[PDB]
């Protein structure tokens with residue numbers, strides 16, 4: 001059954017899409033031989049989230065759900081995993097991941113049409129349980145990054161757009177997780193309560209949507225889930241892993257009106273601990289990382305619904321070419337792997353790095 005109560009990951013199996021599988025098989029494997037080539041083929045089996053970073057990706061969302069329907073009637077029981085990520089004036093704190101819609105060019109109205117498009121696909125496939133991460137970095141940027149003019153002038157649009165996303169996708173087969181940054185971002189004691197207030201306000205302002213399950217953490221980041229020793233670059237923060245973050249912000253969400261909020265955590269680039277990060281704020285194509293804890297609903301945690309792979313390992317975080325569009329200085333740093341292609345595009349060297357440093361190992 002597509003509908004659910006409680007943990008939406010219980011009773012289903014996350015779907016490994018053909019989009020990532022095509023990338024690995026056609027862009028990575030032809031370049032690899034021997035033990036590496038076989039290890040790479042195994043990675044394409046690991047379920048990860050499909051990103052709807054453009055409106056042109058929604059037909060591919062439908063294609064993926066078409067594959068799930070076929071698989072479910074052949075005997076299986078699979079669930080869809082997608083990311084809603086096409087906000088007007090997207091990626092307001094950086095320059096690497098600016099999107100197609102801008103507030104000045106009717107972006108809010110274009111975002112609502114984008115949401116309407118997704119809703120129709122979700123109604124078309126109401127027989128399939130659909131798991132969604134809502135707008136990465138957006139709300140986390142509104143907490144700490146209002147000093148950036150792009151974020152400040154995007155606050156009203158973000159909040160109206162997110163509200164439209166959580167109410168229009170509030171369907172019986174949907175489970176939503178608002179992006180909530182990570183331990184190195186909002187995990188700091190000073191950021192915890194202001195972050196909790198904002199998430200709870202989004203929840204309350206949308207009339208407590210029953211499909212809105214909770215928060216997603218560490219999306220496209222590198223933090224360890226439950227590492228016992230604090231890495232050098234976490235110096236000053238008692239919240240140095242993802243487990244500590246969710247158990248801190250959790251009761252704070254309840255304080256501000258959001259009871260029964262649960263968490264998912266990205267671990268697809270968290271295998272090697274500590275990372276090659278020279279500063280904790282460095283996010284672009286970070287060196288010294290590997291594939292981490294495999295997706296599983298058996299977490300052994302009171303608040304974690306599932307380990308997930310949101311960011312598909314191999315897809316770039318941003319270009320290191322200073323003569324290219326959308327260039328961010330974060331991608332030219334010593335701990336950023338070079339040379340790096342455009343954000344979202346395939347980064348061959350980075351995939352090889354992730355596979356070699358994988359823990360659990362594929363080799």
Ligand SMILES: O=c1cc(-c2ccccc2)c2cc(Cl)c(O[C@@H]3O[C@H](CO)[C@@H](O[C@@H]4O[C@H](CO)[C@@H](O)[C@H](O)[C@H]4O)[C@H](O)[C@H]3O)cc2o1
Nearest residue numbers: 051053093094097136137185220221281283315317343344
């Ligand atoms: O300006 C920032 C700052 C931070 C940050 C703040 C505080 C502490 C540490 C870091 C950022 C952190 C993170 Cl995790 C950021 O995520 C990057 O941005 C996007 C997702 O929001 C990712 O790019 C997208 O990847 C998708 C999947 O491959 C593609 O579909 C999409 O085309 C592409 O835009 C990127 O990989 C993350 O690294 C951004 C921060 O920005």
Ligand SMILES: *[C@@H]1O[C@H](CO)[C@@H](O)[C@H](O)[C@H]1NC(C)=O
Nearest residue numbers: 156159160161163201202205
């Ligand atoms: C509350 O909802 C309205 C839409 O009804 C939206 O425009 C506004 O941004 C929301 N406020 C907050 C604080 O999220």
Ligand SMILES: *[C@@H]1O[C@H](CO)[C@@H](O)[C@H](O)[C@H]1NC(C)=O
Nearest residue numbers: 225226227228293298299300
């Ligand atoms: C961390 O979590 C993983 C996966 O749930 C588990 O194998 C390991 O025992 C945990 N370690 C600690 C120290 O809690």
Ligand SMILES: *[C@H]1O[C@H](CO)[C@@H](O)[C@H](O)[C@@H]1O
Nearest residue numbers: 001002003004005172173
């Ligand atoms: C999905 O949810 C509905 C209730 O909304 C049930 O009727 C069904 O059995 C399943 O649990």
Ligand SMILES: *[C@H]1O[C@H](CO)[C@@H](O)[C@H](O)[C@@H]1O
Nearest residue numbers: 011012013014076077078
């Ligand atoms: C999802 O599908 C997998 C493979 O069929 C199962 O192992 C799991 O129990 C769930 O039904």
Ligand SMILES: *[C@H]1O[C@H](CO)[C@@H](O)[C@H](O)[C@@H]1O
Nearest residue numbers: 018019020022023026027
């Ligand atoms: C399968 O999909 C990937 C990602 O779009 C492509 O890179 C590949 O060429 C094939 O079409």
Ligand SMILES: *[C@H]1O[C@H](CO)[C@@H](O)[C@H](O)[C@@H]1O
Nearest residue numbers: 021022025041042044045
């Ligand atoms: C791409 O195709 C190859 C061979 O068919 C697989 O090994 C891989 O898992 C991916 O699906």
Ligand SMILES: *[C@H]1O[C@H](CO)[C@@H](O)[C@H](O)[C@@H]1O
Nearest residue numbers: 021022023024025026027
């Ligand atoms: C990668 O893309 C090629 C087509 O360019 C396919 O032949 C292959 O199966 C994989 O999807």
Ligand SMILES: *[C@H]1O[C@H](CO)[C@@H](O)[C@H](O)[C@@H]1O
Nearest residue numbers: 027028029030031032348
């Ligand atoms: C795979 O990687 C090799 C280098 O290792 C390239 O030459 C090839 O074009 C493909 O990207």
Ligand SMILES: *[C@H]1O[C@H](CO)[C@@H](O)[C@H](O)[C@@H]1O
Nearest residue numbers: 033034035036037038039
């Ligand atoms: C990994 O193993 C496969 C066999 O499944 C080989 O075909 C490949 O060459 C690599 O050694």
